[PDB]
């Protein structure tokens, strides 16, 4: 009767192609016309049926596709920074998917995620971000791995990198709080 609802509800199978073949779980949920064209509704649908493959999303929100630089940057324009310190944007950000371990495809993500973070004082440029984001990402990675016996200390984190932002360093404080913060918890 009014079960014709239970038929969008098929948009399980978008997600079932979409897990491995991510350009066809697309291709597929606007052949139905599930999903929009535009790409804010990819950076959104990427964003709403969290049943998709969390590293197939990764994979995806950050190709080298003209559709998916933005794609991606609308999806990273659908995550709010506002009011809160870096790291949680990172935090809150780096959840939505599982990083790649792919050089080229980091950059794209952690270019617009820095340099969209320096538009919604410590921070000298937007390219402080884009290379704190990684003090960050190396941070955890070091601390928060088991084999690395030997983990990585406080006048060692915040010491190493000395001058994130132009030629002076960034405040021997906003490294150490931050450093207590994954030290206390683990982004992965």
């Given at each position: 009767?009014?079960?014709?609802?239970?038929?969008?509800?098929?948009?399980?199978?978008?997600?079932?192609?979409?897990?491995?073949?991510?350009?066809?779980?697309?291709?597929?949920?606007?052949?139905?016309?599930?999903?929009?064209?535009?790409?804010?509704?990819?950076?959104?649908?990427?964003?709403?049926?969290?049943?998709?493959?969390?590293?197939?999303?990764?994979?995806?929100?950050?190709?080298?596709?003209?559709?998916?630089?933005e794609?991606?940057?609308?999806?990273?324009?659908?995550?709010?920074?506002?009011?809160?310190?870096?790291?949680?944007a990172?935090?809150?950000?780096?959840?939505?998917?599982?990083?790649?371990?792919?050089?080229?495809?980091?950059?794209?993500?952690?270019?617009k995620?820095?340099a969209?973070?320096?538009?919604?004082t410590?921070?000298?440029?937007?390219?402080?971000?884009?290379?704190?984001?990684?003090?960050?990402?190396?941070?955890?990675?070091?601390?928060?791995?088991?084999?690395?016996?030997?983990?990585?200390?406080?006048?060692?984190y915040?010491?190493?990198?000395?001058?994130?932002?132009?030629?002076?360093?960034?405040?021997?404080?906003?490294?150490?709080?931050?450093?207590?913060?994954?030290?206390?918890?683990?982004?992965?």
């Open positions: 009767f009014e079960v014709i609802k239970q038929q969008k509800e098929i948009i399980e199978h978008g997600i079932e192609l979409f897990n491995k073949k991510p350009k066809r779980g697309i291709q597929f949920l606007q052949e139905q016309g599930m999903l929009g064209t535009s790409v804010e509704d990819i950076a959104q649908f990427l964003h709403q049926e969290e049943r998709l493959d969390s590293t197939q999303v990764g994979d995806f929100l950050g190709d080298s596709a003209r559709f998916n630089k794609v991606m940057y609308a999806y990273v324009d659908q995550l709010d920074f506002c009011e809160k310190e870096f790291v949680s990172l935090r809150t950000f780096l959840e939505g998917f599982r990083l790649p371990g792919e050089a080229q495809k980091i950059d794209r993500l952690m270019e995620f820095a969209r973070y320096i538009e919604c410590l921070f000298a440029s937007a390219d402080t971000a884009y290379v704190l984001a990684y003090s960050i990402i190396m941070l955890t990675t070091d601390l928060h791995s088991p084999q690395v016996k030997n983990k990585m200390t406080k006048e060692q915040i010491k190493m990198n000395r001058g994130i932002n132009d030629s002076k360093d960034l405040p021997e404080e906003y490294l150490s709080s931050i450093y207590e913060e994954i030290e206390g918890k683990k982004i992965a």
